[PDB]
Design an enzyme around this catalytic site. Structure first.
Site, PDB file in Angstrom:
ATOM      1  CE  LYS A  70      65.494  40.408  24.364  1.00 21.14           C
ATOM      2  NZ  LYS A  70      64.202  41.140  24.575  1.00 21.14           N
ATOM      3  CB  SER A  85      59.176  39.975  26.304  1.00 18.93           C
ATOM      4  OG  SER A  85      59.190  40.524  27.610  1.00 18.93           O
ATOM      5  CG  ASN A 118      68.003  46.203  26.651  1.00 19.71           C
ATOM      6  OD1 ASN A 118      67.000  46.027  25.945  1.00 19.71           O
ATOM      7  ND2 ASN A 118      67.941  46.304  27.990  1.00 19.71           N
ATOM      8  N   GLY A 123      63.898  46.143  21.687  1.00 22.18           N
ATOM      9  CA  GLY A 123      62.568  46.392  21.144  1.00 22.18           C
ATOM     10  C   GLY A 123      61.791  45.106  20.884  1.00 22.18           C
ATOM     11  CG  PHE A 124      59.046  43.448  23.244  1.00 21.24           C
ATOM     12  CD1 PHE A 124      59.695  43.055  24.420  1.00 21.24           C
ATOM     13  CD2 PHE A 124      57.796  44.093  23.353  1.00 21.24           C
ATOM     14  CE1 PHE A 124      59.140  43.361  25.672  1.00 21.24           C
ATOM     15  CE2 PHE A 124      57.223  44.364  24.601  1.00 21.24           C
ATOM     16  CZ  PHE A 124      57.924  44.010  25.766  1.00 21.24           C
ATOM     17  CB  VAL A 128      52.686  46.726  31.446  1.00 22.95           C
ATOM     18  CG1 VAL A 128      51.582  45.823  30.910  1.00 22.95           C
ATOM     19  CG2 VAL A 128      52.753  46.650  32.969  1.00 22.95           C
ATOM     20  CB  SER A 187      59.567  46.909  27.312  1.00 23.00           C
ATOM     21  OG  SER A 187      60.642  47.270  26.450  1.00 23.00           O
ATOM     22  CG  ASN A 203      64.000  49.504  24.969  1.00 23.66           C
ATOM     23  OD1 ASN A 203      64.342  50.680  25.110  1.00 23.66           O
ATOM     24  ND2 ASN A 203      64.597  48.495  25.613  1.00 23.66           N
ATOM     25  CB  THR A 204      57.390  48.472  23.115  1.00 29.07           C
ATOM     26  OG1 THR A 204      58.241  47.404  22.679  1.00 29.07           O
ATOM     27  CG2 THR A 204      56.061  48.412  22.325  1.00 29.07           C
ATOM     28  CE  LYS A 246      61.266  42.589  34.357  1.00 29.55           C
ATOM     29  NZ  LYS A 246      62.126  41.670  33.524  1.00 29.55           N
ATOM     30  CB  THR A 298      62.237  47.433  38.560  1.00 30.47           C
ATOM     31  OG1 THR A 298      63.666  47.565  38.491  1.00 30.47           O
ATOM     32  CG2 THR A 298      61.766  47.965  39.919  1.00 30.47           C
ATOM     33  CG  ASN A 299      61.666  45.983  32.292  1.00 30.66           C
ATOM     34  OD1 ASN A 299      62.781  45.974  31.734  1.00 30.66           O
ATOM     35  ND2 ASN A 299      60.589  45.376  31.775  1.00 30.66           N
ATOM     36  CB  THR A 300      66.039  48.333  32.016  1.00 33.40           C
ATOM     37  OG1 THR A 300      65.035  48.404  30.997  1.00 33.40           O
ATOM     38  CG2 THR A 300      66.745  46.984  31.927  1.00 33.40           C
ATOM     39  N   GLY A 320      70.269  44.748  39.281  1.00 34.92           N
ATOM     40  CA  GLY A 320      71.590  44.977  39.875  1.00 34.92           C
ATOM     41  C   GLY A 320      72.022  43.952  40.924  1.00 34.92           C
ATOM     42  CE1 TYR A 356      69.294  40.003  29.531  1.00 34.51           C
ATOM     43  CE2 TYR A 356      71.395  38.864  29.872  1.00 34.51           C
ATOM     44  CZ  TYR A 356      70.437  39.400  29.028  1.00 34.51           C
ATOM     45  OH  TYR A 356      70.615  39.341  27.669  1.00 34.51           O
TER      46      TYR A 356
HETATM   47  C1  LIG Z   1      69.857  42.895  27.074  1.00 35.01           C
HETATM   48  C2  LIG Z   1      68.627  42.882  27.957  1.00 35.01           C
HETATM   49  C3  LIG Z   1      67.420  42.413  27.438  1.00 35.01           C
HETATM   50  C4  LIG Z   1      66.263  42.391  28.236  1.00 35.01           C
HETATM   51  N1  LIG Z   1      65.072  41.939  27.746  1.00 35.01           N
HETATM   52  C5  LIG Z   1      63.954  41.859  28.529  1.00 35.01           C
HETATM   53  C6  LIG Z   1      62.659  41.334  28.047  1.00 35.01           C
HETATM   54  O1  LIG Z   1      62.574  40.885  26.871  1.00 35.01           O
HETATM   55  N2  LIG Z   1      61.617  41.327  28.895  1.00 35.01           N
HETATM   56  C7  LIG Z   1      61.700  41.778  30.178  1.00 35.01           C
HETATM   57  O2  LIG Z   1      60.704  41.740  30.925  1.00 35.01           O
HETATM   58  N3  LIG Z   1      62.849  42.277  30.696  1.00 35.01           N
HETATM   59  C8  LIG Z   1      63.975  42.333  29.942  1.00 35.01           C
HETATM   60  N4  LIG Z   1      65.182  42.821  30.456  1.00 35.01           N
HETATM   61  C9  LIG Z   1      65.200  43.295  31.836  1.00 35.01           C
HETATM   62  C10 LIG Z   1      65.725  42.247  32.808  1.00 35.01           C
HETATM   63  O3  LIG Z   1      64.780  41.167  32.855  1.00 35.01           O
HETATM   64  C11 LIG Z   1      65.847  42.862  34.207  1.00 35.01           C
HETATM   65  O4  LIG Z   1      64.544  43.313  34.627  1.00 35.01           O
HETATM   66  C12 LIG Z   1      66.780  44.086  34.259  1.00 35.01           C
HETATM   67  O5  LIG Z   1      67.870  43.947  33.332  1.00 35.01           O
HETATM   68  C13 LIG Z   1      67.331  44.288  35.685  1.00 35.01           C
HETATM   69  O6  LIG Z   1      68.125  43.176  36.097  1.00 35.01           O
HETATM   70  P1  LIG Z   1      69.741  43.126  35.988  1.00 35.01           P
HETATM   71  O7  LIG Z   1      70.236  44.448  36.535  1.00 35.01           O
HETATM   72  O8  LIG Z   1      70.133  41.943  36.821  1.00 35.01           O
HETATM   73  O9  LIG Z   1      70.053  42.944  34.522  1.00 35.01           O
HETATM   74  C14 LIG Z   1      66.350  42.849  29.650  1.00 35.01           C
HETATM   75  C15 LIG Z   1      67.570  43.310  30.153  1.00 35.01           C
HETATM   76  C16 LIG Z   1      68.704  43.344  29.364  1.00 35.01           C
HETATM   77  C17 LIG Z   1      69.996  43.846  29.985  1.00 35.01           C
HETATM   78  C1  LIG Z   2      77.157  34.885  29.981  1.00 38.45           C
HETATM   79  C2  LIG Z   2      77.585  33.434  29.729  1.00 38.45           C
HETATM   80  C3  LIG Z   2      76.559  32.325  29.981  1.00 38.45           C
HETATM   81  C4  LIG Z   2      78.876  33.161  29.271  1.00 38.45           C
HETATM   82  C5  LIG Z   2      79.476  31.929  28.984  1.00 38.45           C
HETATM   83  C6  LIG Z   2      80.879  32.094  28.373  1.00 38.45           C
HETATM   84  C7  LIG Z   2      80.850  32.659  26.951  1.00 38.45           C
HETATM   85  C8  LIG Z   2      80.310  31.793  25.792  1.00 38.45           C
HETATM   86  C9  LIG Z   2      81.310  33.955  26.719  1.00 38.45           C
HETATM   87  C10 LIG Z   2      81.435  34.629  25.492  1.00 38.45           C
HETATM   88  C11 LIG Z   2      80.352  35.669  25.185  1.00 38.45           C
HETATM   89  C12 LIG Z   2      80.325  36.830  26.186  1.00 38.45           C
HETATM   90  C13 LIG Z   2      81.584  37.689  26.428  1.00 38.45           C
HETATM   91  C14 LIG Z   2      79.117  37.118  26.812  1.00 38.45           C
HETATM   92  C15 LIG Z   2      78.882  38.142  27.754  1.00 38.45           C
HETATM   93  C16 LIG Z   2      77.676  39.028  27.384  1.00 38.45           C
HETATM   94  C17 LIG Z   2      77.829  40.378  27.023  1.00 38.45           C
HETATM   95  O1  LIG Z   2      79.066  40.945  26.991  1.00 38.45           O
HETATM   96  C18 LIG Z   2      76.720  41.169  26.714  1.00 38.45           C
HETATM   97 CL1  LIG Z   2      76.954  42.833  26.309  1.00 38.45          CL
HETATM   98  C19 LIG Z   2      75.428  40.651  26.733  1.00 38.45           C
HETATM   99  C20 LIG Z   2      74.222  41.548  26.371  1.00 38.45           C
HETATM  100  C21 LIG Z   2      75.260  39.307  27.073  1.00 38.45           C
HETATM  101  C22 LIG Z   2      73.867  38.688  27.127  1.00 38.45           C
HETATM  102  O2  LIG Z   2      73.729  37.558  27.586  1.00 38.45           O
HETATM  103  C23 LIG Z   2      76.377  38.519  27.397  1.00 38.45           C
HETATM  104  O3  LIG Z   2      76.194  37.215  27.747  1.00 38.45           O
HETATM  105  O1  LIG Z   3      63.260  43.943  24.252  1.00 37.12           O
HETATM  106  C1  LIG Z   3      63.641  44.922  24.928  1.00 37.12           C
HETATM  107  O2  LIG Z   3      64.121  45.975  24.424  1.00 37.12           O
HETATM  108  C2  LIG Z   3      63.470  45.005  26.408  1.00 37.12           C
HETATM  109  C3  LIG Z   3      62.287  44.595  27.012  1.00 37.12           C
HETATM  110  C4  LIG Z   3      62.170  44.808  28.397  1.00 37.12           C
HETATM  111  O3  LIG Z   3      61.145  44.462  29.000  1.00 37.12           O
HETATM  112  N1  LIG Z   3      63.167  45.404  29.071  1.00 37.12           N
HETATM  113  C5  LIG Z   3      64.291  45.815  28.445  1.00 37.12           C
HETATM  114  O4  LIG Z   3      65.218  46.358  29.108  1.00 37.12           O
HETATM  115  N2  LIG Z   3      64.448  45.612  27.122  1.00 37.12           N
END
Ligand SMILES: Cc1cc2nc3c(=O)[nH]c(=O)nc-3n(C[C@H](O)[C@H](O)[C@H](O)COP(=O)(O)O)c2cc1C
Ligand SMILES: CC(C)=CCC/C(C)=C/CC/C(C)=C/Cc1c(O)c(Cl)c(C)c(C=O)c1O
Ligand SMILES: O=C(O)c1cc(=O)[nH]c(=O)[nH]1
Length: 366
Positions: free
Chosen positions: A70, A90, A115, A118-119, A183, A185, A187-188, A225, A253-255, A305, A326
């Site tokens: 972040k 973000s 999650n 909330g930025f 635009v 999230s 969570n805002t 986004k 997409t976003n979440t 996903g 992610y």
């Molecule tokens: C813990 C967490 C924090 C995230 N924070 C942001 C964010 O700050 N800004 C944003 O655009 N998307 C954010 N996302 C959304 C991811 O960028 C992505 O769009 C979404 O998780 C779908 O991809 P994934 O299924 O591979 O996680 C966040 C997702 C997770 C799980």
């Molecule tokens: C994901 C990564 C680069 C791991 C390297 C090995 C380490 C230091 C693992 C210990 C911490 C751990 C179990 C992380 C997994 C994990 C999580 O279990 C959860 Cl819930 C989140 C939200 C994140 C976000 O990045 C996440 O990384």
């Molecule tokens: O900061 C967050 O809560 C957040 C931002 C965003 O864009 N997407 C998300 O899943 N979480």
């Protein structure tokens, strides 16, 4: 295929997740990545994986999505992990704490996360200085096919959303290969309303004017986004505005604020955005829709996903030029990046594609 993939996925990650709460885990992952404590990824990127889009070369099409780093603390460690591009953010104009803890939740039975951060953000000034300290290193990385994106948010208490984004363009635009107007999230409060036609047109006109005012060498691409929860009307409107204004691309997409039937996790009814496997096909279908609505002329970064080469290729064939992940990283750890790339290369060969570029939007041409 590799033993490291198996060890992380079957043993190390589930054991550590059993010991560490989600946000502590996230913080430790950022720390370990930033310090380069991970071994350097051994997967050599083949020429088949190179993509030219958004005014840049991408060595491979697999990026880290916003929300992991972040505050721009782990950029170099993320390239070391094998990501073709890194998106930070973000980032909000002023520092802000985000929501109270706990605000992240694992759904292990669904391979999903919810999650409501909330930025939480160090703010523009902190991130600006962090990126400035490695700006020339980044210039070389970008030239080498490893671009940097910066994702912009808005503060909770700001009385002018458009001005928040404009400040982000002015401060971080000169340090980014591309900017993301986030635009979507969930969570805002009121943020997703900025996806509406009139609000979006006015916001993006302002953003694009600011961007165009930057010096040529410091002028990033601008992407929007979007949510996976849009109506058909919303998507038509976004496509219309994107084409009217010449927006450089979309991140799709976003979440999701939806809770698909079949979620098993005990925490499924927590408030927030859902990511990971249950989002995958909703995201793919949104990519498909947006590609068609923009006549394949607007680059799309597909996200939601992705955990395998098949997931990546499905989004590419639906219209994505690049993908991000992610949630898969949180479950399977660092080896997932090499896994996705190796599988994607194998599938491209199996389906008779010369490279990623040839596969972009292929389903639309069937
Ligand atoms: C813990 C967490 C924090 C995230 N924070 C942001 C964010 O700050 N800004 C944003 O655009 N998307 C954010 N996302 C959304 C991811 O960028 C992505 O769009 C979404 O998780 C779908 O991809 P994934 O299924 O591979 O996680 C966040 C997702 C997770 C799980
Ligand atoms: C994901 C990564 C680069 C791991 C390297 C090995 C380490 C230091 C693992 C210990 C911490 C751990 C179990 C992380 C997994 C994990 C999580 O279990 C959860 Cl819930 C989140 C939200 C994140 C976000 O990045 C996440 O990384
Ligand atoms: O900061 C967050 O809560 C957040 C931002 C965003 O864009 N997407 C998300 O899943 N979480």
């Amino acid at each position: 295929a590799t033993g490291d993939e198996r060890f992380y996925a079957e043993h190390l990650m589930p054991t550590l997740q059993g010991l560490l709460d989600p946000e502590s885990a996230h913080r430790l992952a950022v720390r370990f990545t930033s310090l380069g404590l991970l071994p350097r990824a051994r997967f050599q990127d083949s020429d088949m994986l190179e993509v030219r889009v958004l005014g840049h070369k991408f060595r491979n099409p697999v990026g880290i999505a916003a929300g992991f780093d972040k505050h721009g603390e782990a950029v170099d460690g993320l390239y070391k992990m094998g990501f073709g591009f890194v998106e930070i953010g973000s980032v909000t104009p002023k520092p802000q704490e985000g929501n109270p803890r706990p605000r992240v939740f694992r759904l292990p039975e669904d391979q999903a996360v919810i999650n409501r951060y909330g930025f939480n953000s160090h703010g523009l000034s902190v991130v600006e200085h962090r990126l400035r300290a490695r700006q020339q290193k980044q210039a070389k990385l970008t030239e080498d096919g490893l671009p940097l994106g910066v994702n912009l948010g808005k503060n909770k208490t700001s009385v002018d959303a458009a001005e928040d984004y404009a400040e982000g363009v002015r401060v971080l635009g000169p340090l980014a290969d591309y900017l993301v107007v986030n635009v979507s999230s969930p969570n805002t409060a009121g943020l997703r309303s900025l996806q509406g036609k009139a609000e979006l047109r006015r916001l993006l006109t302002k953003v694009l004017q600011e961007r165009d005012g930057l010096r040529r060498v410091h002028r990033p691409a601008v992407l929007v986004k979007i949510a996976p929860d849009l109506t058909s009307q919303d998507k038509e409107d976004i496509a219309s505005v994107v084409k009217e204004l010449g927006i450089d691309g979309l991140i799709v997409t976003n979440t999701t604020v939806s809770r698909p039937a079949g979620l098993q996790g005990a925490l499924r009814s927590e408030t927030g955005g859902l990511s990971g496997k249950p989002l995958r096909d909703l995201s793919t279908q949104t990519i498909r829709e947006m590609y068609a609505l923009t006549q394949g002329r607007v680059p799309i970064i597909g996200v939601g996903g992705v955990s395998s080469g098949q997931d990546a290729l499905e989004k590419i064939r639906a219209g994505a030029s690049l993908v991000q992940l992610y949630t898969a990283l949180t479950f399977w750890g660092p080896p997932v990046v090499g896994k996705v790339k190796r599988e994607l290369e194998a599938l491209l060969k199996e389906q008779g594609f010369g490279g990623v570029t040839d596969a972009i939007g292929a389903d639309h041409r069937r």
